[PDB]
Each structure stands twice: as structure tokens, then as C-alpha cells.
Amino acid sequence: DILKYVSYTLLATTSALFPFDHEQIQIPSKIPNFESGLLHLIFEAGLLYQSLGYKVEKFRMLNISPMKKALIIEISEELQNYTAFVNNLVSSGTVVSLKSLYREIYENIIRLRIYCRFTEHLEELSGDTFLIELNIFKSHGDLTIRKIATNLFNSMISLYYEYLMNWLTKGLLRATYGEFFIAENYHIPIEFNQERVPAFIPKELAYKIFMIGKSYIFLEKYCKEVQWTN
Amino acid sequence: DILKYVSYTLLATTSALFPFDHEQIQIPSKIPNFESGLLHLIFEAGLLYQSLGYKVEKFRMLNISPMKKALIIEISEELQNYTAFVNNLVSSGTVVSLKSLYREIYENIIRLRIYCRFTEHLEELSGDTFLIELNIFKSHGDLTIRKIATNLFNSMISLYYEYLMNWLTKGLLRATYGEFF
Amino acid sequence: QEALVVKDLLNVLIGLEGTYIRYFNDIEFKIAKKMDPSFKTFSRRIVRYGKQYMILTRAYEKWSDTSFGMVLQRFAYEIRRFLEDVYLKTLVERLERDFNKVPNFSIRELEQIINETEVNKQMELLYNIYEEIFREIEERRTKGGAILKIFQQKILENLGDRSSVMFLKKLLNNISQDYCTMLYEWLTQGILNDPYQEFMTYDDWDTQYFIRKDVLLRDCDSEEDKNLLFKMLRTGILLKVVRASLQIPTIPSNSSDITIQEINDFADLMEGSNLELYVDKCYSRANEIFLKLFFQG
């Protein structure tokens, strides 16, 4: 019975028989001290998962940046692994120790925590801003953090490369939600956003791209040119 | 035992141990809920086959339009495939799941349904009218419906071409049942 | 208590349309709920799965065995087929294993894999079919061309979310074909097709043709859109007058552009440059045959 509730909480289903404040159990003396302590540790891990799972689900409602969508997709796939783990533990650990339970699912705690910082920063800004958020995080040490940051990156960058190809080859690709460095202002111009590019593309490099692109739009206005070797 | 009755119904033989109303089982609680549901789905498919099989057999009595005969022939040949399928399932699926049974014979359901619309329209009119019935049906979307309609067509048109050749080359070919204008 | 309750729960999942697990037409399927913390959590997960399964089957019936759009028919047959296939194969196998070993084994493992597979595909698919239906209700009160506009708008709208968009694209390329067949016939050989909807072009010596605005335009206003439509009407009129001229030199004797149009459908864009490439080729073929009819005959 004790294992079962603990499992529910790890599944991201709130249990009636452990109180939820925001980070821990507040369970009185009336139950073994020893088990309560062990139970304290489980809830921290289980709380972290539930909170992340709520964030990913909510941000999923489509009609956002794909750059956001690509993070939500990666996050969701990574959470899957957790759910499979809870299942191994119940199946071949019916009467299993909570201290032991805590040690086995150690790696997943390290991973969730870092992600929770990220989801928080996702709230502030939209689009190409994520790549910057992503760049500062990679700068901090530890084999894991960098790895987790690179995997989000491979997905977002695939998207930039596409937006760039539309921009350079057939003219005007507007950012919309921030997919590019086009800013507004027949006769209405565009202009350059230096701020959005992370350090991995210099601001000077981005400008040159803006300049070239601007020239291709001017060639089509003169009188539309047929898609050449470029 | 459960598989066996279900097979009979798919064969176009009515089973004593499932009630026949016109589209489904009306079997009380007294048997597993889970199996009854699965059993609900089987009967819809099996009912469709039996009903089509009765239509083709009845319209077969000769001395009609050949254009009708050519449809009855194509229909009868297509039903054959179904009967061969039931046989594979009994042979190498002696204790086999009804949900699974339902999925395996999926394609055949898609095919029967469309045909049942056709047989209904065959009742109203006779002869060259079928080609019109056939033309409106081809107009509706889906890769299958058009295909099924074209196969009926190749058979009927062969007949028109003949009637036309008699008409043009040696004079007077009367429609009779509607083979010509 | 606990082993029996877990078992009842496993048995039920292979057939929710049962004789004690009842169906409500709108809740969904419901079964009486029982105690144990474990069971009530599990019944909630099951409910969600169940609701989508029942709804996909309702939707599918409406669209099948009857016509409202050619496109609608094709979309329903395909949607159902894939979804069912996945769900039965994984579920039937998963349940059998559990049963073989000792039929009290974890529901949780069966749940996580089916949830994952479904979620991405299913939500988007089901919402879209409804949106198309509301829109048709509105159009009717106010057709073909309107359906093409809505689906192009939806692929743009959803943007990102890779599983769902690639799935929807595969369906889209199959749906595009009737429009492609109509465009090739009209522009290259002068025949306008329209059994009850297949585009949005209607007729009216040499006669005239025009766009039904009510049915809605191809991309419903834009300068590129407008020139392209005008160009389509012009190529088609030349061809039809020449077809009328009997067995006096007709049918372009230069090469086809079906192969060029088909690559535009697989792209699943609405971009001006590709579309413009199609009309100028069709136009030329139509111009040269037109000339030949006149000069020689």
C-alpha cells in the first residue's frame, strides 16, 4: 500500500494520502519515522516530475513558435522513460524499500531539475530568444547540462536553417513569432534585428545575410525573376 | 465454440445461437461483457455479407438484361474471396480473438457496403440505366469506390459495343430489356 | 480483492462495447467503478483512451457511404484505417502476454506505450474533421474550393509538431489529386469537371468561364492569386474552342505537365513560383495548338 501511492505521485497523478503543499509531505507522527523520512525524499522527486508534466501539456496548444514545439516534443519524449521506469519498479519490486526506490531513479532527478529552469525562462520571451537562453545554459559546467542543451539545439537549428533557405532563395520570410531577424518598418520596408541571433551566429554575419536577402527582394520587385541555379 | 458460430454467420448460414433482428445481436447479460462487445462488431460485418449473398442469388434466375447478369457474375466472384478467408481463419486460428477476427477481415467490409447501395438501385430501373447509376457512384471520392465501379463497367460496356455493332452493321437491334436506345 | 479488481480491469480493455460495460451515446462507455486507490486512478486513464476510440468510429460513419465532398470520403477511410490498425495490434499482443504469465500483471506498461502512440496523431486528426464540417455548414447556408483553402490554412496554422504534420501531409497529398486531375483536364484539354464540387470554376459560340466566388477562391485574394486565376481561365477557353473545331488539328502535341503539377501537390505549399510555372507551360501548349487550328484549318 505504501509503495502504491508513491507510484501514483511518480506517474504525475496526485495521491489523496499524502498532502500536497508545493515541495513536501507534512504527514504527522502516527506512522514510522524511518519510512516518513524516506517518504520525504520521494515526494521531492515526484513533485518535480508532476510540475514539468503540467508545463509541457499547457504549452502544447499549437500555433506558437516551432522552436518552442520542438522543445515540447523533446521534453515529452524524455518523460516517457520515467513512466517505463515506475513500471519496472512496481512489477519486480512489489515490496521494495523507499530509500532504495529513491537511489534507483536518481538520474531522472538530475535531468528534471535542469529542465524546470528552462520552462521558466520559456515564459518570458518567444522564438529565437530560446537559442540565447540555451547558449548561456551550455556555458555552465557538468557533462549532463551541455548534453541536454545540445539535444534541444539540434531540433531548433533545423528550423532556422529552413527559415534562412526560404529567406535567401525566394525572398521575404517574416518572423511572425520569431523565426527570423525580419522586423517591420508595397512601400513598407524591413529591417535587421541584431538582438535575436545567439553568439553562434555573429551579429555581423546575420547582417550580411539581411543585406543579400534585401537585394533578392529588390530583384523580384524590378520584375519577378524565375528560380535560377541559386 | 464461440468462434464456430461466428464463422457460420460469416458463411451466410444463420446461426441458432445468436439472435437475428436485422443488424445486431440482442444477446442478454449471461456471457462475458467483453466478448459480447466484440461479438457486436462481428455480426455487422457478417449481416452485410448474408444480405448481399441473398440479393445476388435471387436476381440470378436468368432472362434479364445481360448488363445485370454481368454485375451478378462480378459480385459472385468477389464473394468467393470472403469464403476462402473464413477458411484461413478457422484452420490456423482455432482459438482466436474476436477483436482480432474483426481487424483481419476489415477490407471486405469496406467492399460489401458500397455494393449494397448498388443492388438497391438495381431494383428501380432496368438495363442502360445502370451505367448512369454507375457514373454518379464513380464521381464520389475514395480510391476503392471508383475501382469497384470501373470493374462493373468493363463488363457492361463490352455488351454495349456488341449491341451497337449489330445495330450499325445489320440494322435493327431492339433494346428488349434495355440494351440500346 | 486487489488481484480480482486488477484482473476485471485488464479483461474489459479488449472490448468496451460489452454487455456490462455499457455505452452512453454522447459520457462514453461507462462501467461501475469500485474501490482500491489503484483502480480509480487507472479507470481515469482508461476513460480518455476510450473516449477518442468511440468518437473516431462516429465520425468515420458520417463521412463513409455517402458524399459531401470527394476529399472528405478519402480523408475518413484513411484516418480510420491507420488508427485502428495501430491500436488493435499493440493492445491485443500486450494483453495476451500479461494473461499468459499470470493475468494480474501491470496495466501501467500497456498504458504508457498506447498513450504515446495515439496522442500526437489523434488530437489533431479528430479536431480537423470537425472544423471542416462546421465550415461546410456555414458555406451551404451562404464547397470544393473552400475545402482546399481550409486545409492549406491548417498546415500553415499548426506550424511545428513533427509527428502530426508529416502524418497530415501524407493524407493531404492523396486528397490533392482530384484537384490536380481537374486542373490538368481544364488547362491542357479544355474539359471542366464538376459533379457537385471539385473546384470552384463554372461555365458562364466561344463562350466564357468564371470563378464561383461563393465556393471560395483558391487562396481567396492576393495579387499572385488573381493573376494565376486569370491565366487559368484564358488557357482553358482556347482549348475548348479548338476542341469544338472537331478533328481539325487539336490536343497539344507538346509534352504534358501532369508530372510538374504532381510534384507541386507533394510539396504541399501554395507558393506563387511553382504554381506560376505550371500555368505558363499549360498556356504555351494551349497557345501553339490554338495557332495551329487557326492557321492550317
Curated annotation (Swiss-Prot), chain A:
Subcellular location: Nucleus; Cytoplasm, Cytoskeleton, Microtubule organizing center, Spindle pole body
Residue runs in coiled coils: none
Function: Involved in microtubule organization by the microtubule organizing center, the spindle pole body (SPB). Probably part of the microtubule attachment site at the SPB.
Assembly information from the UniProt record: Interacts with TUB4, SPC72 and SPC97.
Sequence similarity: Belongs to the TUBGCP family.
Additional free-text comment from the UniProt record: Present with 56 molecules/cell in log phase SD medium.
Protein name: Spindle pole body component SPC98
Curated annotation (Swiss-Prot), chain C:
Assigned protein family: Belongs to the TUBGCP family.
Source organism per UniProt: Saccharomyces cerevisiae (strain ATCC 204508 / S288c)
Note: Present with 2230 molecules/cell in log phase SD medium.
UniProt subcellular location: Nucleus; Cytoplasm, Cytoskeleton, Microtubule organizing center, Spindle pole body
Subunit structure of this chain's protein: Interacts with TUB4, SPC72 and SPC98.
Reported function: Involved in microtubule organization by the microtubule organizing center, the spindle pole body (SPB). Probably part of the microtubule attachment site at the SPB.
Protein name: Spindle pole body component SPC97
